[PDB]
């Protein structure tokens, strides 16, 4: 429940993070204009990415690890090849098919990339053609975050509709309509089982859902917690729910009961991103105080 | 603990030196936030200093100016307005001859936008600059269509004083914030002179806080 290492970030601010497949390396995204691939054990940065567009709000690390995706409000998604013959980092192709701000990019597969944008719709992209194969419409609000299943077949996205809409990747078809939120879904996360998911939003209430149930199992709310929720993540075995908050501290609620199991108050600033490794040894927390911190 | 670890240390030192140099190079440039509304004279203002947001860079004397034009965003403003928390100045453009155009007149809704952007929490202390546009047409055509509450003469000076006064009355939670207003003639040579003196005054007053003086 204490800090084990402190990356201290790179230069200014930190918005989003994504744990790699190796479970040793992470990607850090920030408004400064530099994307940094980090090492957890050695506390040494292993890659630096300049950005043509300074404004970036999302980052994705591929499950293979060959590619990393960064994008922002410029309407252009940039996918960079980490492993090149030159050894540099070069954007594979520009992805400019949205009229809004690219809120969250996620890597279904090397070929198939899912992007959520301010155009109030999502679209599957192919790297070879740079063309949308399936465009998921229906979200009235601008889709702010999507969570992908482990199977990479069914995924859910969330917007400023106070609702979540499931999507099938193959046919571009809305699969479920989840409702129960009172405010904009700031972030969404998928259960590692693939059968459920829980969300948090600005109404300071975390909410658990199941894809087939389409129903609220139980809400996680505290009277002292008026602070809105910016990040949600899960343990590998359940019985845990790590959650960022607007109160400048992170909190850990039990998945089944939501007691005040863990109080997490290291970061001085708003916890922008909260990520857990795929095997689950450590939790990484990032914020706009320029600091990245990994605890256990 | 071998040659691989020593080499990783050297590379990690290398990228940090490069990062520090790039940050020091970037810190000099002055960031400006343009908030042009429709036919507010965006083409005019970009000509006078000479699918997402449009970035421009103009150099005045010894000072660099990077200004980001948020144009045709077509999205909820709150979700990305805080990305410009660190900006030094917010430039506003408002047409003056839009007092005869109803979509809710454009002046009233522009006032509401100014009230919202002034009264927010992030912009507690950010200096606000506002420009004007189409004032010669406004003086030529002119009152009762948009502001019957004036009950004053259609004289351009008197009417323009009334309009600018009411717009500067939108200083909500702006005790620390300043409203530099300007009678933009739309043909004045360097209206960036107002911007340079305004940003210079802001830099001076913030330098006092940097020393702890004020």
């Amino acid at each position, epitope marked *: 429940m204490r800090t084990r290492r402190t990356l201290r970030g790179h230069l200014a601010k930190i918005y989003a993070m994504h744990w790699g497949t*190796d479970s*040793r*390396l992470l990607v850090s995204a920030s408004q400064d204009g530099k994307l940094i691939i980090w*090492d957890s054990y*050695t506390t040494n940065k*292993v*890659h630096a990415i300049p950005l043509r567009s300074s404004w970036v709000m999302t980052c994705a690390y591929a499950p293979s690890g060959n590619y990393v995706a960064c994008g922002g409000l410029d309407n252009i998604c940039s996918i960079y090849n980490l492993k090149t*013959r*030159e*050894g*540099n980092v070069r954007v594979s192709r520009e992805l400019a098919g949205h009229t809004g701000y690219l809120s969250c990019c996620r890597f279904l597969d090397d070929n198939q990339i899912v992007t959520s944008s301010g155009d109030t719709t999502c679209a599957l992209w192919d790297i070879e053609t740079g063309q949308q194969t399936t465009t998921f419409t229906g979200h009235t609000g601008d889709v702010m975050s999507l969570s992908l299943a482990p199977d990479t077949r069914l995924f859910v996205s969330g917007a400023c509709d106070a609702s979540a809409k499931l999507w099938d990747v193959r046919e571009g078809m809305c699969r479920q309509t989840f409702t129960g939120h009172e405010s904009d879904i700031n972030a969404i996360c998928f259960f590692p089982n693939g059968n459920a998911f829980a969300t948090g939003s600005d109404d300071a209430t975390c909410r658990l859902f199941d894809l087939r149930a389409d129903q609220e199992l139980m809400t996680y709310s505290h009277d002292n917690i008026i602070c809105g929720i910016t990040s949600v993540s899960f343990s590998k075995s359940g019985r845990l729910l790590l959650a960022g908050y607007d109160d400048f501290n992170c909190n850990v609620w039990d998945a089944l009961k939501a007691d005040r199991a863990g109080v997490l108050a290291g970061h001085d600033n708003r916890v922008s991103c909260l990520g857990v490794t795929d095997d689950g040894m450590a939790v990484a927390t990032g914020s706009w105080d320029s600091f990245l911190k990994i605890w256990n | *603990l*071998s*040659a*691989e670890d*020593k*080499a*990783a240390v*050297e*590379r990690s*030192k*290398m990228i940090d*030196r490069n990062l520090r140099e790039d940050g020091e190079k970037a810190a000099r440039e002055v960031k400006l936030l343009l908030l042009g509304a429709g036919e507010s004279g965006k083409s005019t203002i970009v000509k006078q200093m000479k699918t997402g947001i449009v970035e421009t860079h103009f150099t005045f004397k010894d000072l660099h100016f990077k200004m980001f034009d948020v144009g045709a965003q077509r999205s909820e403003r709150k979700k990305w307005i805080h990305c410009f928390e660190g900006v030094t100045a917010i430039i506003f453009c408002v047409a003056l001859s839009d007092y005869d155009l109803v979509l809710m007149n454009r002046m009233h809704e522009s006032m509401k936008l100014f009230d919202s952007i002034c009264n927010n929490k992030w912009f507690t202390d950010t200096s606000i600059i506002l420009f004007l546009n189409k004032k010669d047409l406004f003086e030529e055509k002119i009152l009762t269509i948009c502001y019957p509450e004036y009950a004053g003469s259609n004289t351009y000076e008197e009417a323009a004083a009334y309009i600018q006064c009411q717009f500067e009355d939108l200083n909500k939670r702006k005790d620390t914030k300043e409203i530099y207003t300007h009678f933009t003639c739309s043909t004045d040579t360097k209206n960036v002179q107002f911007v340079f003196d305004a940003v210079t005054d802001v830099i001076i007053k913030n330098n006092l806080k940097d020393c702890g003086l004020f």
Partner: single-chain antibody
Amino acid sequence: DVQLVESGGGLVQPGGSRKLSCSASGFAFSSFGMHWVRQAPEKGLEWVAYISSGSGTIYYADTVKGRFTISRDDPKNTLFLQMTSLRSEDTAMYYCVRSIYYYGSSPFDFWGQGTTLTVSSDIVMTQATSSVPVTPGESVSISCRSSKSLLHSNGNTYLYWFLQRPGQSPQLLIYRMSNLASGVPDRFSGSGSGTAFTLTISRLEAEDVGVYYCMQHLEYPLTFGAGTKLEL
């Protein structure tokens, strides 16, 4: 892709000095670390010199200290190495080598053409036999026998194995005992314990001929293996 062309590898008076340099193009040599490897006219690759990306750390061998010098040039994008006090053992077929260093990087991946230079403790590794007669289609194995264990405290051993095609630049087969290199068929696979090591050549055909080498990467004085010929 990449280009490494060495410059002016010729005759040198005994004990004298001569500037050698691998002209470089097509890669981020600013961000890449560089090595040099000697090849005696018949047998024996052994490491010579190291220059890092930031030109901060300079590591030499037992006979290499002082009498050699290394240098670089980032705007013109090339690599220099000056050698003084050249004798018979100092004559070798030096190969300009690039090697980037981080987690999962593949050092010693690309090589040049060579320096035709003719004039006029330490960890010990030896492969068992230097000659193995083979048949095009049956699986063989060759073993490099170290003298100390290569298993570091962090639980990951450091061990890189090399193939040399007859007359040309060598390649990297497998790095740190478990990871095959790019552009290499899967038929080659290293194996062994933390102290004893052996190859797994499977279904060899008429491009695997050449000499095979081993290397440690647990101490800064890197020393390759003796080399093993795989004749048909």
